[PDB]
């Protein structure tokens, strides 16, 4: 269910993407933290132009240095846990590129040229 | 060009994490842990998932320790602080029956300040020697063991401390992974991992030496050491059969209420009516002997030599040398030397009773346990032994601090954070209209 | 088993010293606690004790005239009083009385009464 | 030491109780001089019913309060029930009830 | 004007649809809960397919079980408050169905991804 | 086939709800309930809306009570305690200005420490009989009332406790509905409902028998009760006309000061110059008689065709038998027995003064009210009664809960939660194909 | 380039840093604990108030959006080549500071009309 | 025309603001500022951005002040109370070795309660006379100076108050701007501005007349004032070169420990052996002369009149007239008159020691500084002076509100609120989409 297919390959696992004072302070910290995490993820999908989607594609190409593997092995012979570890050192690079692409698209949409 | 970045959300990936867990659910327990748990909790098996567990480094244990202390202190805070009792006491011979002297008791008289500030009154109560210190020497002047350090808070007379199971629950965004390997034994990779949101429910039992009313091992007895080879670690032997223990205090303590202030009173023993023995506990002999034999059978797998010796605990404070536990609100300190004495119908262990308690050490604080009227009997399950190790190996019923009692139950759980975002290459570039 | 005799200062003179003792059969003289329970005519008995502890306790009612006395080798509980008045008529009973001991850690229950006697000390 | 008295006035052939209220009472117990020249314990170990006490007997020592009750409802139950405790010094023995019922 | 223009036809909605220690704990709880309530409604609208919308048309039909009244009885009444009470016991059914409908739509789109 | 679901957000729907409201408005009330109000707040009217109000089930009164306790607790906490004064008091009925005996304000001497812990000396102060407890029969020795079993703390002389009007305001997501039906009882539906973000201001006036300084009823006198018929229920009477009550303490008091501890002192009553009456209240006859006749005309609609009698209260301590006023630390407990005496140009009620007060019935924490120098004159507007019932029926001006003094103004307000989501039928499917 | 990097750059040039500014709005023993929670809650409230404000005029989910509200020359009688080029956002904020909430009331109104015109009118199409 | 409104989010603009700042890293400062610092601080230069700074209106100083008071007060709460010491003292002349007269200290005998409510013990301790008040004329009776005022508490020996750099950090949604103009001089536009996540780290050093251990001016000596003409304000002179100051207490102090009350302990001076001059500070003469000369030359740019004279403080409270500081945990009050007597190898300042301190000028609390055993030396860096202006013109060491010593470090920082939303016109219209 919740983490169902966690040990399955990434391709297979795509099927589950659709799935008193001190006490007071701990409860407030837990609630505030949950909100902050929610908003950070929504903000990030928003800034990349993936708002409301589980599957989102972009205009950023995958770099040849980001594991240098083929799709026929990546999706079929690896799990998401393994994949996340395999490319973890490119996390910020990819996120930055996604933000740049989306911002450029938005700028193109309001150009004085075309648009009208 | 091919190989485009694709963003996915809802990805089944987690990382190790430390967070605040919910305690969830006249008794102190659940006085604040008042949130009903899921009546139908689910467990999800993760196929082909192997995780590394380490009970000795489990943050859940550390967090429980803090919750236990915090609840305890909050519970005791709103009631009388026993400060007017730092007085010189007479503590004379407590006598009974045919001119018998009670070995553990003294009749202490003192001048109490009363609620009206111009009065002083002579009051007296019957006290245990364990709570009293000799002043000077060759003298009738005595003092309580406190004052030397700090004041004692009287336990709030209307609060029960009887343990109930508590299920710790992860906050949304977090999950608890559970290890279901029958022979997992403390640390390392665990296959057959399942996901739960809340733990199975652990009673916050605070005994030492012999663990009481815990979960029972399902398979073979598990030794569960941090390092079996190095004799500097606690060994938590988890038994797969419970040993029955019964404890009795065969007497009625009467009570005298001494007013000590403007709305405050101190409770103390008046007279003791009943037997002379302060307390005792007993364990069936065949059960104990066989149980200990089963434990050595497994110890021999780590120590493959036919000479295992059990000896009584080392010297020190009663809190570490005896079997300390809470029995009906009473505090028992039982002598287990009769159990841990062997080389490889029942046994009765004498028990001491003490009223000024320093639970979890803490040092700067103490609690006074009011006398309890009526006689007390407790029946409980011995579910695991705490051993320390000293070819011809010797083991003793020693132990660590209270965290070890919870390590023995929380060993199968780990907290992780869920990270639903991730990326991977695809064949499709974003379609832009 | 420890049956005991009645006792009184029989034929005592009025306003004169008087004494009595209650021999107990099947008993140690030092049979743990022991006391008099000489309830006065129409009144409660005064406290007293002559325990195995070689006690000589008495209630304030005894003033400085009366006192508990050590039991005889015959295990006869004993007591005496100076200038006993004819006014102080009593049952002169002996007993394993309540408050005959500190009882810091009491057990079960016990009692004994020996037997009553006349104690008018008339004329 | 404190004392208090029941002062008899008990009902005959009816459930009834003797009572006391001595300020210094502690672990007080009852006995009654219902016959001859001796009191039989009604209670021992403070208020606990005495061994061989009437099955219908009960007691309620409660600091400066006491009772010696029975549902026995005997006729002419002129049991001179009384309270005693060591109290402050020596012992406090209240004559308490006289002719009771 | 919160809850202003109450009553009248359902269509009356128009465009009115436009929105020390103990003390510190009470105030933090009040603010945090206001945030949580806001976000839960936004999450619920999101799962049903409503994002940035006041009014959404879905693919969930009405059951005679919930209401056997017609379209000439509902809306035309000068209220909604009583009506919401009349079908309050089906709220969770309609809401569950709205989630199922969106899940099917998401699945249909997922398996028919439009690619450049 | 033509019946489809449409989802709507922001629809004006509300539900009964319980939440925390906040206050809006040299004294405690201003310090805590310091948030400003919206000037010229806009009230709106809900056309053709009927709603149910229930003043006896309205949790705002409970909230108000709790906040009052909370404020007084915070306010009194950082001030001088009087524990050091609970010493034997040597008292005589000596006077300061009276050549004879005033039968009150006794002159008590006592031994108290000063700024130095090793120095103790005799001090004198005058006390009210209501504040003094005799230690034994015919004894000259006394103790302060409420010392035995309870603490006494001085009221903070540095800050006032004024009945400033306070408005309660809704948190986001909530709205306050108000009933604008002038003859509404608080027992059912109101067919004219308006909505506000804040209630009108309510002055936190405390009284025990008669209701003071609130709003007046519009229209005729309104009699409000949870039941009317039940003799176990209080019937609040809300007058449409006020009656002036003028109370005074005509004598000139002075003060002395007893230093207690490093930076603390006790404010003690010294000499009193003036008349014999300690206090009294001025009520006109014509107004009172007319007021009762008007009340009777309305009682007759609930209790027709029978005679009624007004009688003095049945008994209990002052807090439930007399009319309490707070005109400063010189608290008044006035005898209204001569006011409520009738069957169906001015009068004076005798009145007493008390300084050690178990306000809110929190008897474990008595407050000492410091004396006020000079004389006191205070007036108030009576708005109602907390009168309780039991041919002929009897009406007794008995006491009641403190919450009864707030329900009389909060009866017209209700708190509801805004619930913006809902659905409605249409005849369309989603336009995504 | 960084948070407020290029703040002095032209209005146009600065549009390429919108993605940076947008990410620094959210974060990564007793009374003190309250001070910190209050700060965190308030930062969240500010974030959400701005998202609701942006969403109310139909721009949810975008860093850059347009509306149907015309630019009245009373607001700023300068052309695009004058403001997007030789002027910064800080200067601009001051230049039109008076119309704070004037523009927003207008944005809310135009969106209200846009939504009204899509409600019932030509709906289910 | 043909332009329409475009709405932008993420616009790099800000407004002046006041918000809550947080602090980043046995030491009280380290314990409180538990949050780690950025190991690699980043800075952004705001090329072509100018901004207005005003150090005298900078809300960061107020917050720093408040955080310090709060931490100080909290640190001292779980410690020994010395209120049991408000007793009569004998305070006779103390003897050190063969010195019968010690001007600064007296030998005070007293009556003190120990852990028991029993006969008090007679104890003796040495006290500085600056903290002792004589109770009457020609009398042997003495009291602690802060009794008959407020509670006196003892600092815990376990806690260090040694200043560590404190980094103030912005919360999300906020930023701190930093002024990089070497000659900024307190107020007005700064034409070279950069941003930081946190400040550079300021040690919270407490001093009066001279500022210690700050950062030196980047350029030449800077004289800062809210208003030069106005003689009612502090002039902060910020030096570009430091002056080395050595402070010593050349005596080996012997400490004792007196149990006070039920578990608490009072630390007190037993004996002092050494060079009984008690304390002094050593300042190079030529360094001071060069420093003063340079300051005056810069002063003359504000004050063109020749022969401006420097004088000693005019008088008033010790905390103002004398140079105070914490040296090794001890509290020094040094005489600076020798530093300010002109119109311009070493010199020394005689210096006194106190133990009871009304720090922060709040009389409601007083800290007793436990005595420190052995001898104390420290060397500090004089980095700026606190001066006030009063015929030519004259200057004296000034006083301050303990904000001045922090304004001198925070003058270059400003807090601003980020405002991401704004609008501008475009050529495009929404159209239909
Ligand atoms: C349902 O409740 C409404 C809210 O209380 C009532 O509306 C109020 O009526 C008042 C008059 O009855 C208005 O105030 C006064 O109106 C007169 C009109 O002639 C003016 O001259 C007065 O100057 C004005 N008073 C003041 C101080 O200005 C209230 O303004 C009005 N309130 C609102 C919010 O509209 C309804 O009348 C009531 N309906 C029923 C059946 O009782
Ligand atoms: C200004 O800065 C200097 C350092 O640059 C500070 O001097 C330092 O002061 C501390 C506390 O007095 C000294 O710590 C002590 O050291 C001894 C060992 O020598 C140890 O036994 C003690 O437990 C304690 O740790 C430190 O050594 C000393 N540094 C030097 C170089 O001497 C000075 O205190 C600061 N001035 C002000 C006003 O804050
Ligand atoms: C209330 O009824 C009147 C009847 O004339 C109508 O005009 C008005 O619009 C109705 N208002 C609401 C909110 O239903
Ligand atoms: C005190 O009495 C005088 C008598 O003339 C009166 O004028 C004054 O108002 C009274 N003051 C108070 C506060 O009662
Ligand atoms: C500042 O102005 C110069 C002018 O040549 C320009 O090159 C530089 O990019 C500007 N700085 C910023 C932040 O845009
Ligand atoms: C331009 O703005 C002014 C501002 O007062 C307004 O009066 C005028 O009508 C506006 N012109 C338009 C919107 O065409
Ligand atoms: C202080 O007085 C006591 C009195 O017994 C003496 O023993 C002690 O040496 C004196 N201390 C000093 C420093 O003079
Ligand atoms: C208490 O104070 C008295 C004052 O005369 C003095 O004589 C006595 O010695 C002191 N006792 C103690 C314990 O210091």
mmCIF file of C-alpha atoms in Angstrom, chain B residues 210-354:
data_model
loop_
_atom_site.group_PDB
_atom_site.id
_atom_site.type_symbol
_atom_site.label_atom_id
_atom_site.label_comp_id
_atom_site.label_asym_id
_atom_site.label_seq_id
_atom_site.Cartn_x
_atom_site.Cartn_y
_atom_site.Cartn_z
ATOM 1 C CA UNK B 210 14.601 -8.948 35.732
ATOM 2 C CA UNK B 211 12.364 -7.376 33.141
ATOM 3 C CA UNK B 212 8.717 -7.634 33.926
ATOM 4 C CA UNK B 213 5.543 -7.902 31.753
ATOM 5 C CA UNK B 214 7.339 -7.400 28.359
ATOM 6 C CA UNK B 215 6.748 -9.042 25.051
ATOM 7 C CA UNK B 216 7.896 -12.598 24.776
ATOM 8 C CA UNK B 217 10.376 -13.991 22.278
ATOM 9 C CA UNK B 218 8.594 -16.092 19.662
ATOM 10 C CA UNK B 219 11.476 -18.349 18.659
ATOM 11 C CA UNK B 220 14.653 -19.366 20.436
ATOM 12 C CA UNK B 221 16.041 -17.394 23.333
ATOM 13 C CA UNK B 222 17.844 -14.419 21.881
ATOM 14 C CA UNK B 223 21.012 -13.140 23.539
ATOM 15 C CA UNK B 224 20.868 -9.645 21.962
ATOM 16 C CA UNK B 225 24.221 -8.151 22.951
ATOM 17 C CA UNK B 226 25.837 -5.050 21.426
ATOM 18 C CA UNK B 227 29.144 -6.835 21.377
ATOM 19 C CA UNK B 228 29.149 -10.299 22.852
ATOM 20 C CA UNK B 229 32.950 -10.596 22.754
ATOM 21 C CA UNK B 230 33.754 -7.429 24.672
ATOM 22 C CA UNK B 231 32.764 -7.765 28.344
ATOM 23 C CA UNK B 232 31.715 -4.136 28.697
ATOM 24 C CA UNK B 233 28.169 -4.281 27.387
ATOM 25 C CA UNK B 234 24.730 -5.129 28.614
ATOM 26 C CA UNK B 235 23.415 -8.452 27.403
ATOM 27 C CA UNK B 236 19.648 -8.514 27.103
ATOM 28 C CA UNK B 237 18.553 -12.084 27.144
ATOM 29 C CA UNK B 238 15.081 -12.318 25.768
ATOM 30 C CA UNK B 239 13.271 -15.410 26.958
ATOM 31 C CA UNK B 240 10.607 -17.254 24.826
ATOM 32 C CA UNK B 241 8.776 -18.613 27.984
ATOM 33 C CA UNK B 242 7.626 -16.410 30.840
ATOM 34 C CA UNK B 243 8.685 -17.193 34.378
ATOM 35 C CA UNK B 244 5.986 -16.684 36.951
ATOM 36 C CA UNK B 245 6.879 -14.509 39.905
ATOM 37 C CA UNK B 246 4.699 -13.622 42.861
ATOM 38 C CA UNK B 247 5.532 -10.852 45.392
ATOM 39 C CA UNK B 248 3.936 -10.251 48.721
ATOM 40 C CA UNK B 249 3.961 -7.700 51.491
ATOM 41 C CA UNK B 250 2.030 -9.676 54.172
ATOM 42 C CA UNK B 251 1.040 -6.812 56.449
ATOM 43 C CA UNK B 252 -1.281 -3.738 56.839
ATOM 44 C CA UNK B 253 0.448 -0.311 57.336
ATOM 45 C CA UNK B 254 -1.838 1.998 59.274
ATOM 46 C CA UNK B 255 -1.519 5.683 58.583
ATOM 47 C CA UNK B 256 -0.999 8.862 60.460
ATOM 48 C CA UNK B 257 -1.611 12.157 58.723
ATOM 49 C CA UNK B 258 0.650 14.893 59.875
ATOM 50 C CA UNK B 259 -0.332 18.355 58.889
ATOM 51 C CA UNK B 260 2.757 20.170 57.742
ATOM 52 C CA UNK B 261 1.336 23.323 56.235
ATOM 53 C CA UNK B 262 -1.648 25.414 55.052
ATOM 54 C CA UNK B 263 -3.423 22.682 53.122
ATOM 55 C CA UNK B 264 -0.607 20.143 53.251
ATOM 56 C CA UNK B 265 -0.023 16.870 55.056
ATOM 57 C CA UNK B 266 2.599 14.218 55.223
ATOM 58 C CA UNK B 267 1.688 10.619 55.366
ATOM 59 C CA UNK B 268 3.579 8.136 57.417
ATOM 60 C CA UNK B 269 3.248 4.684 58.862
ATOM 61 C CA UNK B 270 1.437 4.362 62.134
ATOM 62 C CA UNK B 271 1.667 0.680 63.022
ATOM 63 C CA UNK B 272 2.329 -2.458 61.040
ATOM 64 C CA UNK B 273 -0.208 -5.197 61.591
ATOM 65 C CA UNK B 274 0.564 -8.667 60.248
ATOM 66 C CA UNK B 275 3.696 -10.746 59.732
ATOM 67 C CA UNK B 276 7.194 -9.636 60.659
ATOM 68 C CA UNK B 277 8.758 -10.245 57.269
ATOM 69 C CA UNK B 278 8.925 -6.933 55.439
ATOM 70 C CA UNK B 279 8.306 -8.567 52.098
ATOM 71 C CA UNK B 280 9.204 -11.565 49.998
ATOM 72 C CA UNK B 281 8.883 -12.934 46.395
ATOM 73 C CA UNK B 282 8.965 -16.475 45.126
ATOM 74 C CA UNK B 283 9.599 -18.324 41.788
ATOM 75 C CA UNK B 284 8.878 -21.990 41.030
ATOM 76 C CA UNK B 285 12.100 -23.994 41.252
ATOM 77 C CA UNK B 286 11.705 -26.162 38.230
ATOM 78 C CA UNK B 287 10.788 -23.253 36.081
ATOM 79 C CA UNK B 288 13.749 -21.214 37.133
ATOM 80 C CA UNK B 289 16.249 -24.013 36.881
ATOM 81 C CA UNK B 290 15.126 -25.031 33.425
ATOM 82 C CA UNK B 291 14.991 -21.442 32.239
ATOM 83 C CA UNK B 292 18.496 -20.741 33.337
ATOM 84 C CA UNK B 293 19.639 -23.953 31.674
ATOM 85 C CA UNK B 294 18.036 -22.872 28.408
ATOM 86 C CA UNK B 295 19.848 -19.564 28.589
ATOM 87 C CA UNK B 296 23.229 -21.197 29.008
ATOM 88 C CA UNK B 297 22.504 -23.485 26.110
ATOM 89 C CA UNK B 298 22.404 -20.373 23.953
ATOM 90 C CA UNK B 299 25.303 -18.633 25.720
ATOM 91 C CA UNK B 300 27.486 -21.601 24.813
ATOM 92 C CA UNK B 301 27.074 -20.645 21.149
ATOM 93 C CA UNK B 302 29.099 -17.514 21.865
ATOM 94 C CA UNK B 303 31.176 -19.051 24.611
ATOM 95 C CA UNK B 304 31.888 -22.642 23.423
ATOM 96 C CA UNK B 305 33.335 -23.976 26.658
ATOM 97 C CA UNK B 306 31.562 -26.177 29.208
ATOM 98 C CA UNK B 307 31.948 -23.913 32.248
ATOM 99 C CA UNK B 308 29.427 -21.103 32.771
ATOM 100 C CA UNK B 309 29.079 -19.598 36.202
ATOM 101 C CA UNK B 310 26.361 -17.406 37.578
ATOM 102 C CA UNK B 311 27.017 -15.278 40.548
ATOM 103 C CA UNK B 312 25.073 -12.669 42.557
ATOM 104 C CA UNK B 313 25.362 -9.031 41.747
ATOM 105 C CA UNK B 314 28.313 -6.853 42.627
ATOM 106 C CA UNK B 315 28.128 -4.358 45.455
ATOM 107 C CA UNK B 316 26.562 -0.928 45.160
ATOM 108 C CA UNK B 317 23.270 0.828 45.830
ATOM 109 C CA UNK B 318 20.099 -1.255 46.175
ATOM 110 C CA UNK B 319 18.815 0.254 42.944
ATOM 111 C CA UNK B 320 21.485 -1.691 41.048
ATOM 112 C CA UNK B 321 22.275 -4.657 43.312
ATOM 113 C CA UNK B 322 18.707 -5.799 43.915
ATOM 114 C CA UNK B 323 15.634 -6.435 41.880
ATOM 115 C CA UNK B 324 13.965 -3.091 42.091
ATOM 116 C CA UNK B 325 10.328 -2.717 41.110
ATOM 117 C CA UNK B 326 6.997 -0.980 41.724
ATOM 118 C CA UNK B 327 4.394 -3.421 43.239
ATOM 119 C CA UNK B 328 1.012 -1.820 43.745
ATOM 120 C CA UNK B 329 2.632 1.561 44.395
ATOM 121 C CA UNK B 330 5.078 0.030 46.869
ATOM 122 C CA UNK B 331 8.829 -0.026 46.261
ATOM 123 C CA UNK B 332 10.556 -3.372 46.516
ATOM 124 C CA UNK B 333 14.266 -4.197 46.488
ATOM 125 C CA UNK B 334 14.561 -8.055 46.303
ATOM 126 C CA UNK B 335 17.674 -10.150 46.821
ATOM 127 C CA UNK B 336 18.271 -12.312 43.668
ATOM 128 C CA UNK B 337 21.442 -13.951 44.975
ATOM 129 C CA UNK B 338 19.406 -17.087 45.428
ATOM 130 C CA UNK B 339 18.668 -17.180 41.704
ATOM 131 C CA UNK B 340 21.995 -16.336 40.174
ATOM 132 C CA UNK B 341 24.108 -18.930 41.866
ATOM 133 C CA UNK B 342 25.088 -21.894 39.745
ATOM 134 C CA UNK B 343 27.653 -23.581 37.549
ATOM 135 C CA UNK B 344 26.957 -25.205 34.139
ATOM 136 C CA UNK B 345 9.194 -26.718 45.046
ATOM 137 C CA UNK B 346 9.941 -22.880 44.949
ATOM 138 C CA UNK B 347 12.566 -20.369 45.887
ATOM 139 C CA UNK B 348 11.772 -17.509 48.180
ATOM 140 C CA UNK B 349 13.731 -14.310 47.989
ATOM 141 C CA UNK B 350 13.646 -11.830 50.915
ATOM 142 C CA UNK B 351 12.729 -8.256 49.860
ATOM 143 C CA UNK B 352 13.395 -4.863 51.333
ATOM 144 C CA UNK B 353 10.997 -1.939 51.348
ATOM 145 C CA UNK B 354 12.106 1.667 50.880
#
